[PDB]
Amino acid sequence: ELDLPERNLDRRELRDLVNELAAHPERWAEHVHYASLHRDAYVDVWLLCWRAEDDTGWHDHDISSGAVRVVAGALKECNPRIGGEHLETVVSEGESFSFGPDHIHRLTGAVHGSVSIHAYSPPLWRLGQYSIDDSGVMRRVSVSY
Numbered sequence: 001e002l003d004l005p006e007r008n009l010d011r012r013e014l015r016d017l018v019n020e021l022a023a024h025p026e027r028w029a030e031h032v033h034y035a036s037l038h039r040d041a042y043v044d045v046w047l048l049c050w051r052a053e054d055d056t057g058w059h060d061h062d063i064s065s066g067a068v069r070v071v072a073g074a075l076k077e078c079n080p081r082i083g084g085e086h087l088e089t090v091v092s093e094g095e096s097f098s099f100g101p102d103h104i105h106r107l108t109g110a111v112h113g114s115v116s117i118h119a120y121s122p123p124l125w126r127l128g129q130y131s132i133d134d135s136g137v138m139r140r141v142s143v144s145y
């Protein structure tokens with residue numbers, strides 16, 4: 001695992017975490033499709049390797065805050081809008097962002113071979129996945145992780 005604090009990390013601390021981890025390839029190069037780098041009572045960290053078709057779908061992280069750092073490549077951070085015309089932001093290698101627990105988003109459109117580091121605190125034990133039925137009606141399925 002990683003040698004992290006024995007407490008929850010907030011948004012800025014998770015962002016610091018994913019960015020410093022990207023600077024320490026000894027922590028993750030071997031795991032270069034996902035690999036856990038660390039799971040305890042306070043923090044989850046994953047390494048994700050992306051194919052072009054990968055798509056998280058729309059989801060929240062329940063009570064988890066989180067942060068993402070793109071190590072190689074680029075992907076789209078998408079935010080949902082009620083009208084239906086969703087925001088898309090390309091996040092490129094070297095760049096990172098963070099979010100509190102109210103965040104709903106979707107990650108897709110990755111460059112093939114992209115690599116990112118994701119950290120969540122409290123741990124990512126539940127995730128809400130949104131879906132739309134035939135009539136356009138939205139639901140949230142809470143998934144254990």
Ligand SMILES: C[N+](C)(C)[C@@H](Cc1c[nH]c(=S)[nH]1)C(=O)O
Binds near residue numbers: 034046048056145
């Ligand atoms: C690696 N993982 C735990 C299996 C998750 C984590 C995840 C990927 N993207 C976002 S946002 N969260 C996933 O790939 O769904």
Ligand SMILES: [Ca+2]
Binds near residue numbers: 072074
């Ligand atoms: Ca690339």
Ligand SMILES: [Mg+2]
Binds near residue numbers: 020023
């Ligand atoms: Mg350093």
Ligand code: NI
Binds near residue numbers: 059060061105
């Ligand atoms: Ni997410």
